[PDB]
């Protein structure tokens, strides 16, 4: 399992207590982009988890060169996580990816605890599905937690291996979350009830409209993940070979995450027939962002995604026939690089250093 | 790593996906007596060459249309022997009023059109054919169509009737037609020394090679004309690694191709792939491909595509090579500016005076 990308996209570590659970933000939770009354989350320290997130994205290799968050090319292992190398695998086979799981906070609590009061229940909805994104889209081996894709809460609940049916419930029904249900175990979250009061009210407890709303994105996520071979490459050298990030360096614009994974005739053979690239687009923002380093380059998104119109977390997104693409807020896109007659050149990688 | 055809083959299967194996020289791929054949018309003086009066046709241009050419012979290289025809009995008369030869627009190996008859639609069949095919048409202006009994030719002369430069439907609906048609001049190289299939009743083999010689023996015996072939040895229809009609730069890269002298992109000057006549082996395939269309297919003449591309002294090398297989042959070509000056004294009008290579 990879703590790597799940740190930096859940926000903070385990062992938070008390308003460290409110002050470490994540991607995800805003981090930067639309901070809490409490975060204290520098430019540099956002920036970082960005860099962990991509690596993480890419299968969370050891030797895989990337342009950090100083813009300096630095290889998987070289990007700290507390001391440690981030990137540690031979091949994304080797990594499990995660935003949820049976122990600590679920996804949705740790939102609850981390979201600014300015972001409503729709922007939390899609908070939720972009962190699960960076799972659902990204090299590394697919992991969640059951219920994830019903906003699942144990009501701020940490370590409920003995917070029986009442905690752990798993409304199959869709009328709630389980959030809101009672104050959690003293013995083991009695120091975070101050940050639970705080945070409880902050905003409603969804409904079969909203666990039906998330239920469709994440049914949308999966379904982009089993769309093309270039999602799953599998061996560590594929990755290196395909794919790239965008929106890299110091002068980066914080909450976008641009992954790109050529088929092109400079990485290799032909994997998708119909495809010559892929473009992974996350806007973890509350403003809407634009895309101009695909200049003149013909894409289209998903089918899987034009199929699900107004519901689809790609709903607004704009691509210009000069090959602009404009983002909406809170929003995950897949560009296409539609294949001709032929495998044509694609979206091929910097090349910056090698192994 | 890939499979790639022969740049040297001399037969095909269908679609120039595999080279065949073959003999020329085979009584089975000739007309009775083909061995005997002659020129109608001299080319061996000044005086002789001088009375050279040329018919530029095309295989589709000839018997598409007219309906005393047998309906499977139309659009083939065999409907030059439908002796009771208006076309043949035109070209006939023709001939016997001063044309003296005959131009064929590309019948050399070309790419731009499908050898498969199950993935291409021409106008001369049901509206349904064409959507089938093409998956376009089904979703235009004209998808209404797919459903009524009536033919492309029928659709297209209705579309005429509200036909103006405001409503221009009937080239609308022909820019679909175009992609999945029987149709292409063919500048677009795929083999130099074979046939086009698509001009054969049976692409699959050697088949295109008796008939490509049968017309030949219909134009210069039952027509009583010489035969001039258009070459376009100035490009390759692709390059590059994956282009299924990339031959040259496949067995090979960057040989063949005229590159930018900076980024080594295949230059594009005269359309499509620049090749390089300027290089050796580039130099010693136009020449053996000549000799085959010289001795083994009896052609009496040369126009070469955008000649200003190759340099003068490559055409007079190929000139006097061909000229050993046949002393009275006659080149000539399109010898305008081509740009190619920086590199090599270009095969143009004005450096051609006095070498006998017309322009
Ligand atoms: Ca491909
Ligand atoms: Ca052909
Ligand atoms: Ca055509
Ligand atoms: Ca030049």
Redesign the pocket.
């Known amino acids: 399992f990879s703590d790597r990308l799940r740190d930096s996209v859940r926000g903070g570590g385990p062992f938070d207590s008390g308003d460290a659970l409110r002050q470490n933000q994540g991607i995800g939770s805003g981090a930067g982009v639309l901070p809490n009354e409490l975060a204290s989350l520098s430019d540099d320290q956002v920036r970082h988890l960005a860099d962990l997130t991509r690596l993480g994205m890419a299968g969370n290799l050891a030797d895989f060169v990337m342009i950090d968050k100083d813009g300096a090319a630095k290889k998987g292992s070289e990007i700290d996580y507390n001391g440690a190398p981030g990137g540690y695998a031979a091949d994304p086979t080797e990594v499990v990816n995660y935003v949820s799981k049976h122990d600590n906070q679920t996804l949705w609590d740790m939102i609850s605890y981390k979201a600014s009061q300015e972001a409503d229940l729709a922007t939390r909805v899609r908070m939720q599905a972009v962190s699960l994104a960076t799972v659902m889209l990204g090299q590394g081996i697919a992991f969640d937690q059951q219920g994830s894709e019903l906003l699942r809460s144990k009501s701020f609940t940490r370590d409920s291996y003995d917070s029986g049916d009442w905690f752990n419930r798993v409304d199959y029904s869709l009328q709630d979350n389980n959030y809101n249900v009672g104050m959690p175990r003293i013995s083991d979250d009695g120091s975070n009830y101050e940050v639970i009061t705080r945070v409880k009210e902050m905003v409603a407890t969804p409904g079969e409209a909203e666990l039906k709303q998330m239920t469709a994105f994440y049914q949308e996520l999966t379904e982009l993940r089993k769309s093309s071979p270039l999602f799953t490459l599998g061996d560590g050298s594929a990755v290196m070979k395909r794919v790239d990030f965008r929106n890299t360096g110091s002068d980066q614009q914080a909450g976008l995450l641009v992954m790109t994974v050529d088929d092109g005739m400079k990485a290799g053979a032909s994997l998708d027939s119909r495809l010559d690239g892929l473009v992974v687009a996350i806007n973890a923002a509350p403003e809407s962002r634009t895309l101009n380093e695909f200049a003149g380059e013909t894409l289209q998104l998903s089918a899987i995604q034009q199929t699900a119109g107004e519901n689809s977390l790609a709903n607004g997104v704009q691509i210009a026939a000069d090959g602009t693409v404009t983002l909406p807020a809170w929003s995950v896109a897949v560009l296409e690089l539609p294949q001709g007659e032929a495998q044509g050149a694609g979206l091929p990688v910097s090349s910056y250093y090698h192994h | 790593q890939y499979e790639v055809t022969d740049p040297y083959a001399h037969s095909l299967s269908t679609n120039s996906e595999y080279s065949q194996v073959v003999d020329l020289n085979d009584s089975a791929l000739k007309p009775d007596g083909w061995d005997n054949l002659t020129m109608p018309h001299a080319q061996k003086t000044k005086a002789d060459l001088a009375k050279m009066t040329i018919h530029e046709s095309h295989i589709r241009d000839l018997s598409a249309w007219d309906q005393t050419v047998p309906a499977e012979l139309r659009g083939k290289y065999l409907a030059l022997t439908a002796g009771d025809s208006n076309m043949v009995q035109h070209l006939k008369t023709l001939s016997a009023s001063g044309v003296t030869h005959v131009e064929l627009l590309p019948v050399f190996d070309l790419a731009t059109v499908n050898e498969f008859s199950d993935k291409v639609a021409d106008i001369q069949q049901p509206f349904s054919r064409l959507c089938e095919v093409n998956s376009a048409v089904k979703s235009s202006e004209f998808a209404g169509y797919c459903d009524s009994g009536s033919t492309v030719e029928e659709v297209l002369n209705q579309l005429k009737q509200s036909d103006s430069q405001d409503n221009p439907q009937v080239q609308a609906l022909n820019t679909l037609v175009a992609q999945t048609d029987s149709y292409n001049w063919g500048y677009d190289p795929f083999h130099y020394t074979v046939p086009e299939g698509s001009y054969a009743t049976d692409p699959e083999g050697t088949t295109r090679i008796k008939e490509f010689r049968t017309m030949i023996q219909a134009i210069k015996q039952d027509l009583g004309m010489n035969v001039i072939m258009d070459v376009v040895y100035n490009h390759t229809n692709a390059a590059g690694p994956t282009d299924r009609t990339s031959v040259l730069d496949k067995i090979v890269p960057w040989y063949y191709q005229r590159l ?2 900076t980024t080594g992109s295949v ?1 594009s000057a005269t359309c499509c792939s620049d090749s390089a006549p300027e290089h050796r082996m580039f130099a010693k395939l136009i020449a053996d491909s000549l000799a085959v269309w010289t001795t083994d297919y009896k052609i009496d003449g040369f126009r070469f595509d955008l000649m200003g591309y190759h340099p003068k002294a490559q055409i007079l090398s190929a000139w006097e090579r061909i000229k050993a297989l046949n002393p009275d042959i006659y080149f000539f070509g399109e010898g305008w500016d081509s ?2 000056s ?2 090599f004294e270009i095969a143009s009008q004005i450096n051609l005076k006095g070498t006998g290579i017309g322009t």
């Open positions: 930018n002298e230059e740009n190619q920086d590199r």
